[PDB]
A paper describes a structure:
Staphylococcal picoviruses are a group of strictly lytic, short-tailed bacteriophages with compact genomes that are attractive candidates for therapeutic use. Here, we report the structure of the complete virion of S. epidermidis–infecting phage Andhra, determined using high-resolution cryo–electron microscopy, allowing atomic modeling of 11 capsid and tail proteins. The overall structure of the Andhra virion follows that of other phages in this group, with an isometric head (capsid) around 500 Å in diameter (vertex to vertex), connected to a 400-Å-long, straight tail surrounded by 12 appendages. The head has icosahedral symmetry, with the tail attached to a portal structure located at 1 of the 12 fivefold vertices.
To resolve the tip density, we carried out another masked reconstruction focused on the tail tip without the application of symmetry, reaching a resolution of 4.9 Å. This reconstruction revealed a twofold symmetric structure consisting mostly of α helices, with a four-helix bundle inserting into the knob. An AlphaFold model for Andhra gp10 revealed the two expected domains (GyH and CHAP), separated by a helix-sheet-helix linker domain (residues 211 to 277). The three domains were individually fitted into the tail tip reconstruction, revealing a gp10 dimer with the N-terminal GyH domains at the bottom of the tip and the C-terminal CHAP domains at the top. The two α helices of the linker domain fit into the connecting densities between the tip and the knob, with the β sheet penetrating into the gp12 knob protein above. After fitting the gp10 dimer into the tip density, it was clear that the tip contained at least one other, primarily α-helical protein. After subtracting the gp10 density, the remaining density appeared as a flat disc with quasi-threefold symmetry. Closer analysis revealed that the disc was made of three dimers, with the twofold symmetry axis of the tip passing through one dimer and the other two dimers on opposite sides of the tip. We generated AlphaFold models for each of these proteins. gp2, gp4, and gp5 were a poor match for the tail tip density, but gp1 had a compact, α-helical structure that could be fitted as three dimers into the tail tip disc density. The tail tip lysins insert into the knob and stabilize the internal loops that hold back the terminal protein and the DNA, thus coupling cell wall penetration to DNA release.
Residue numbers in the entry:
A (entry chain D), B (entry chain C), C (entry chain B): 1 to 90
D (entry chain A): 1 to 194, 211 to 473
The structure:
Amino acid sequence: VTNEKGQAYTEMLQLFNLLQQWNDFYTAENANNLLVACQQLLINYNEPVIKFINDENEDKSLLQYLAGDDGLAQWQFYKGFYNNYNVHIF
Amino acid sequence: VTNEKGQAYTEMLQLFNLLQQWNDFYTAENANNLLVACQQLLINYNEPVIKFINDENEDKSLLQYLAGDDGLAQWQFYKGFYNNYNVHIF
Amino acid sequence: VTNEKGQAYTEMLQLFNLLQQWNDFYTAENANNLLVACQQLLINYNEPVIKFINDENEDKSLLQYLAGDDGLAQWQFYKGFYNNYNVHIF
Amino acid sequence: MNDKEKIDKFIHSNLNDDFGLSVDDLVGKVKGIGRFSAWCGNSSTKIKQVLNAVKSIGVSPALFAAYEKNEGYNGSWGWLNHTSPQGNYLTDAQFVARKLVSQSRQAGTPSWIDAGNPVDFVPASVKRKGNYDFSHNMKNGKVGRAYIPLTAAATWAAYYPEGLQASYNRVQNYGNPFLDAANTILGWGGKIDGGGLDVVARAFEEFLKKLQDSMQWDLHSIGTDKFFSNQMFTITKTYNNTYRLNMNQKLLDEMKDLISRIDGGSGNDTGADDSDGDHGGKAGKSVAPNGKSGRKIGGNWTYSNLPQKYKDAIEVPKFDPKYLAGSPFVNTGDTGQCTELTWAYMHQIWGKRQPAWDNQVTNGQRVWVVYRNQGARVTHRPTVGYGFSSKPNYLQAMLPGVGHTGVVVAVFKDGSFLTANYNVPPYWAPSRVVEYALIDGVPENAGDNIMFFSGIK
């Protein structure tokens, strides 16, 4: 049980650091938005997010793990997510 | 199993949002430090942190849950923690 | 008299520069708070502050000069000071 | 680049500038160099710890390493020359990195005179130009802001390099800290120089491909020569030599749904009578879907900041947090979710514990199915006291496959309605803050995009 809580904290920090590369952190509001966006990704899309975190490929996309290879599905997911959290997940 | 990972993600976000009230987020460096500090608190002091997160008292102190009612012990803990993470936990 | 005014301005600049090492300056509000804090220290604790400014020891602490070697007294002083000015004086 | 251009670009670089060198590039290059040799024992692991620590504090590993190489090793001094060591190698490196970051942001003036050997030889014209550059051109967090105030050698190196010579300063020959650090970083291979729109395009290309996919299926003959339609397209004879191509309504819905809703478009699911049937229901007021898809025409107000006219129009009791207590969403980590408000508020309005799940994932778009499976009616009419399920684009639904849910608390003569919601901006889960939003009516052909369900009786 102790390992599982430690792993969840590591997964959240890893996802946050990856998404931070595509998100401006100048404002405190955006920093809060990315934190909320990461916790909603881990709660609703755990298996996709864990695959994305553990992928060592330079061209890896979280959208591919979340919506598959269909660009229109990826776009519709991204647009819905960005409207809700103001966070980039490319 | 699914519930435990969701709960650890919620506890992390709740602790981060509480500690954010005492920590300036203007710099990206401070944001990473608070994320690491919250993970280290939940990994090493899970039971105290869960009590603090679930306390509805306005005057609740995380230091009281971590070091007890002794102000010198609370100060020694706070000083060691602040030196290591540059994070306020009052 | 001319020397005394020059000395007080040097003491204020020296204290401000020392305390600046422990205080994030990103915001104008924090810069204003440190200015007021340094003046209140030099007005109410001149002798302790002058000893701290003239100490060449790497481990020197302004709290030791203000509250003595008792860690609980140093904590109580620091907590009251930080609450009033939002400034670190370790 | 001449030496003056190197110094100028270097002092104007950010204190955290990597200079094109990673921590891994530096670890091999700093072996044998002063304190990296004496304190870290040339250990790649200890060197990486120091360089990562200074980087995390906001100081360039390349700048910190270049400084140590040029300054040299004195056992009595810490990583910053003329300072005692502070604790162990790592603690001292972190202390020096914090001092450099503080100094760079610090109020400062160039140190025109060496404190140890005070000779004023620098022309007042040079001092004025250097003071102007340092105060107006050199922003906080720059390399020059960290070093120019600390020493006269740094000030002379930046604005009067000839002052480093004993001829000019009348004391001794000084090293050039900026040129030596710049040359060391360049020698190491470091360099001194001083949005989903495509996704939109890919989406359009997919739609074009989707048009191809619809066409893949073979047509059937509708009646005789007059028509030849399938389920997506109609071939209708126009004249002896003419056929006009119409499109089946399904096709328009098939992709039109894709435009707004990625999956589940409209299921033509069993609905409710156009008649309000208030008698049929427990109570409350309803309005017919009026078209004008629209969306939230105002909202996210807490009860305290809700405009009085909308507050007066609320026909349901104000939400009481006591209904949340004992919530099944607390155990699942779903505290403050829109489904939790729907469950608790419908429990308050209907007086019975409402369903949270049906052995499937329950979310904003599907919660109406959970209630319907328990005998909860459901309708396309926004009805006061009824829960709603909305796929993305509707009633604040932002995520495809998750949707949004809440309770209808008022309906207006223009067909607009007020909703009570959780997990919407600015109060995301797990805040449990009730937010009121005005919605612009309902599209006539929304179907399962928007469903309005009652509470179980």
